[PDB]
Design a protein around this ligand. Sequence first.
Ligand SMILES: N[C@H]1CCN(S(=O)(=O)c2ccccc2)C1
Ligand SMILES: N[C@H]1CCN(S(=O)(=O)c2ccccc2)C1
Ligand SMILES: N[C@H]1CCN(S(=O)(=O)c2ccccc2)C1
Ligand SMILES: [Zn+2]
Ligand SMILES: [Zn+2]
Ligand SMILES: [Zn+2]
Ligand SMILES: [Zn+2]
Lengths: 75, 69
Amino acid sequence: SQQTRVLQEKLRKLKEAMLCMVCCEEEINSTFCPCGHTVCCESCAAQLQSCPVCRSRVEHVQHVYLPTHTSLLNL
Amino acid sequence: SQQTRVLQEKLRKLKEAMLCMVCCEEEINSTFCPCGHTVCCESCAAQLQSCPVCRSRVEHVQHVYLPTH
Ligand SMILES: N[C@H]1CCN(S(=O)(=O)c2ccccc2)C1
Ligand SMILES: N[C@H]1CCN(S(=O)(=O)c2ccccc2)C1
Ligand SMILES: N[C@H]1CCN(S(=O)(=O)c2ccccc2)C1
Ligand SMILES: [Zn+2]
Ligand SMILES: [Zn+2]
Ligand SMILES: [Zn+2]
Ligand SMILES: [Zn+2]
Protein backbone atom coordinates (compact mmCIF):
# COMPACT_ATOMS: atom_id res chain seq x y z
CA SER A 1 0.00 0.00 0.00
CA GLN A 2 0.99 3.72 0.08
CA GLN A 3 1.70 3.18 3.87
CA THR A 4 4.32 0.53 2.94
CA ARG A 5 6.06 3.15 0.69
CA VAL A 6 6.04 5.73 3.53
CA LEU A 7 7.65 3.21 5.97
CA GLN A 8 10.28 2.22 3.37
CA GLU A 9 11.28 5.92 3.07
CA LYS A 10 11.55 6.34 6.86
CA LEU A 11 13.76 3.23 7.13
CA ARG A 12 15.95 4.35 4.22
CA LYS A 13 16.52 7.82 5.72
CA LEU A 14 17.41 6.47 9.18
CA LYS A 15 19.93 4.02 7.63
CA GLU A 16 21.49 6.80 5.48
CA ALA A 17 21.89 9.00 8.62
CA MET A 18 24.20 6.22 10.04
CA LEU A 19 26.69 6.53 7.15
CA CYS A 20 29.98 8.54 7.07
CA MET A 21 29.44 12.21 5.98
CA VAL A 22 32.63 12.18 3.91
CA CYS A 23 32.59 8.84 1.95
CA CYS A 24 28.82 8.08 2.23
CA GLU A 25 29.72 4.33 2.10
CA GLU A 26 30.89 3.13 5.49
CA GLU A 27 29.14 3.25 8.85
CA ILE A 28 29.97 6.00 11.31
CA ASN A 29 32.16 4.46 14.07
CA SER A 30 34.53 7.28 15.17
CA THR A 31 34.22 10.39 17.36
CA PHE A 32 36.30 13.61 17.11
CA CYS A 33 37.45 14.46 20.70
CA PRO A 34 36.85 16.60 22.64
CA CYS A 35 34.03 18.18 20.56
CA GLY A 36 32.05 14.94 20.30
CA HIS A 37 30.92 15.13 16.64
CA THR A 38 30.46 11.46 15.56
CA VAL A 39 30.04 11.72 11.78
CA CYS A 40 32.84 9.70 10.14
CA CYS A 41 34.10 6.16 9.50
CA GLU A 42 37.62 5.29 10.82
CA SER A 43 39.35 5.89 7.48
CA CYS A 44 37.82 9.35 6.84
CA ALA A 45 38.41 10.47 10.49
CA ALA A 46 42.10 9.44 10.41
CA GLN A 47 43.72 12.54 8.84
CA LEU A 48 41.34 15.38 9.71
CA GLN A 49 43.07 17.99 11.91
CA SER A 50 39.83 19.92 12.70
CA CYS A 51 36.22 18.82 13.05
CA PRO A 52 34.34 19.02 9.66
CA VAL A 53 31.15 20.10 11.56
CA CYS A 54 32.38 22.71 14.15
CA ARG A 55 36.03 23.42 13.16
CA SER A 56 37.34 22.57 16.67
CA ARG A 57 40.83 21.00 16.81
CA VAL A 58 40.78 17.19 16.86
CA GLU A 59 42.94 16.19 19.85
CA HIS A 60 42.28 12.49 19.11
CA VAL A 61 39.68 10.09 17.62
CA GLN A 62 37.73 7.68 19.90
CA HIS A 63 36.39 4.46 18.28
CA VAL A 64 32.70 3.84 19.12
CA TYR A 65 30.83 0.53 19.36
CA LEU A 66 27.10 1.28 18.72
CA PRO A 67 24.16 -1.20 18.99
CA THR A 68 22.96 -0.09 15.48
CA HIS A 69 26.21 -1.30 13.81
CA THR A 70 25.38 -3.87 10.96
CA SER A 71 28.25 -3.66 8.38
CA LEU A 72 30.87 -6.46 8.19
CA LEU A 73 33.57 -3.87 9.18
CA ASN A 74 31.84 -3.22 12.55
CA LEU A 75 30.87 -6.88 13.33
CA SER B 1 -0.47 -5.39 3.73
CA GLN B 2 1.69 -7.95 5.59
CA GLN B 3 4.80 -6.02 4.29
CA THR B 4 3.52 -2.88 6.13
CA ARG B 5 3.64 -4.90 9.42
CA VAL B 6 7.14 -6.26 8.57
CA LEU B 7 8.47 -2.70 7.91
CA GLN B 8 6.86 -1.37 11.11
CA GLU B 9 8.74 -4.05 13.08
CA LYS B 10 12.06 -3.24 11.37
CA LEU B 11 11.59 0.49 12.12
CA ARG B 12 10.66 -0.24 15.74
CA LYS B 13 13.77 -2.42 16.27
CA LEU B 14 16.13 0.16 14.72
CA LYS B 15 14.61 2.95 16.88
CA GLU B 16 14.88 0.74 20.02
CA ALA B 17 18.59 0.08 19.21
CA MET B 18 19.18 3.88 19.52
CA LEU B 19 17.77 3.97 23.12
CA CYS B 20 19.79 3.66 26.34
CA MET B 21 20.37 -0.06 27.28
CA VAL B 22 19.91 0.76 31.01
CA CYS B 23 16.83 3.10 31.25
CA CYS B 24 15.25 2.18 27.85
CA GLU B 25 13.79 5.73 27.72
CA GLU B 26 16.39 8.23 26.54
CA GLU B 27 18.54 8.33 23.38
CA ILE B 28 22.10 7.00 23.49
CA ASN B 29 24.47 10.01 23.47
CA SER B 30 27.45 9.00 25.65
CA THR B 31 30.59 6.87 25.23
CA PHE B 32 32.45 5.06 28.04
CA CYS B 33 36.21 5.82 27.57
CA PRO B 34 38.59 4.28 26.80
CA CYS B 35 36.64 1.09 25.85
CA GLY B 36 34.36 2.87 23.39
CA HIS B 37 31.03 1.17 24.27
CA THR B 38 28.32 3.71 23.32
CA VAL B 39 25.14 2.26 24.84
CA CYS B 40 23.81 4.79 27.40
CA CYS B 41 22.13 8.17 27.82
CA GLU B 42 24.12 10.79 29.84
CA SER B 43 22.12 10.19 33.05
CA CYS B 44 22.77 6.42 33.24
CA ALA B 45 26.41 6.83 32.00
CA ALA B 46 27.11 9.29 34.89
CA GLN B 47 26.13 6.65 37.47
CA LEU B 48 28.29 3.74 36.24
CA GLN B 49 31.91 3.28 37.42
CA SER B 50 32.36 0.21 35.17
CA CYS B 51 31.19 -0.31 31.55
CA PRO B 52 27.90 -2.38 31.53
CA VAL B 53 29.02 -4.20 28.34
CA CYS B 54 32.73 -5.14 29.09
CA ARG B 55 33.22 -4.25 32.79
CA SER B 56 36.29 -2.07 32.02
CA ARG B 57 36.75 0.91 34.41
CA VAL B 58 35.18 4.15 33.06
CA GLU B 59 38.08 6.70 32.92
CA HIS B 60 35.67 9.31 31.54
CA VAL B 61 32.41 9.80 29.56
CA GLN B 62 32.58 11.47 26.09
CA HIS B 63 29.34 13.11 24.89
CA VAL B 64 28.54 12.17 21.24
CA TYR B 65 26.59 14.22 18.66
CA LEU B 66 25.13 11.69 16.13
CA PRO B 67 23.24 12.56 12.89
CA THR B 68 20.42 10.11 13.93
CA HIS B 69 19.64 12.17 17.09
N1 LIG C 1 29.51 -4.24 17.34
C1 LIG C 1 28.91 -4.64 18.62
C2 LIG C 1 29.99 -4.81 19.70
C3 LIG C 1 29.35 -4.27 20.95
N2 LIG C 1 28.54 -3.15 20.43
S1 LIG C 1 27.58 -2.42 21.52
O1 LIG C 1 26.84 -1.43 20.81
O2 LIG C 1 28.43 -2.03 22.61
C4 LIG C 1 26.42 -3.62 22.12
C5 LIG C 1 26.69 -4.33 23.28
C6 LIG C 1 25.77 -5.27 23.73
C7 LIG C 1 24.59 -5.48 23.04
C8 LIG C 1 24.31 -4.75 21.91
C9 LIG C 1 25.23 -3.82 21.45
C10 LIG C 1 27.88 -3.64 19.20
N1 LIG D 1 45.55 8.18 27.55
C1 LIG D 1 44.25 8.77 27.24
C2 LIG D 1 43.84 8.66 25.77
C3 LIG D 1 42.37 8.92 25.84
N2 LIG D 1 41.97 8.10 27.01
S1 LIG D 1 40.50 8.45 27.63
O1 LIG D 1 40.12 7.35 28.46
O2 LIG D 1 39.69 8.81 26.51
C4 LIG D 1 40.67 9.87 28.68
C5 LIG D 1 40.88 11.13 28.14
C6 LIG D 1 40.97 12.23 28.97
C7 LIG D 1 40.85 12.08 30.33
C8 LIG D 1 40.65 10.83 30.87
C9 LIG D 1 40.56 9.72 30.05
C10 LIG D 1 43.08 8.11 27.99
N1 LIG E 1 23.31 17.28 9.85
C1 LIG E 1 24.45 16.62 10.48
C2 LIG E 1 25.71 17.52 10.50
C3 LIG E 1 26.47 16.96 11.65
N2 LIG E 1 25.40 16.80 12.66
S1 LIG E 1 25.84 16.04 14.03
O1 LIG E 1 27.19 16.43 14.30
O2 LIG E 1 25.53 14.65 13.86
C4 LIG E 1 24.81 16.66 15.32
C5 LIG E 1 24.01 15.79 16.04
C6 LIG E 1 23.21 16.28 17.06
C7 LIG E 1 23.17 17.62 17.32
C8 LIG E 1 23.93 18.49 16.57
C9 LIG E 1 24.76 18.02 15.58
C10 LIG E 1 24.23 16.24 11.96
ZN1 LIG F 1 34.16 7.56 5.43
ZN1 LIG G 1 32.96 19.10 16.20
ZN1 LIG H 1 19.56 5.88 30.39
ZN1 LIG I 1 33.08 -1.24 27.51
